[PDB]
Write a protein that binds this DNA or RNA. Structure first.
Lengths: 62, 61
DNA sequence: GGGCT
DNA sequence: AGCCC
């Protein structure tokens, strides 16, 4: 799907290796929505600063 | 290390923002995913489950 | 590599 | 001049 923004295999490997847990399909969808929201907040910060580039300091996790 | 699909993130930010994406931006997004997944493991384990589910990924903040 | 922010 | 397409 063109909608998936996370590397499914690497996310499942992290959760398996660090948690001994499986990962639901819906977990991948929520993580992809999280990325989309972070990128859109990033665009707003960069635009407010009059920049053309989304930089690390534009991505704030509360 | 990289947990986001770099080409799709750059396409989203280019298409939705008419902006470039810094290399460090990709690293911060990957750190964000790692932290969300590890908080997910905590919630799932606390609930006695063997699967990280959507309700384990808390993002409303 | 070839420009750009 | 460091860094992005």
């Amino acid at each position: 799907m063109a909608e998936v923004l996370v590397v499914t295999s690497k996310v499942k490997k992290l959760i398996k290796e660090k948690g001994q847990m499986n990962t639901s399909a819906e977990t991948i969808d929520v993580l992809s929505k999280a990325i989309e929201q972070l990128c859109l907040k990033g665009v707003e910060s960069a635009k407010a600063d009059g920049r053309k580039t989304v930089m690390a300091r534009d991505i704030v996790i509360d």
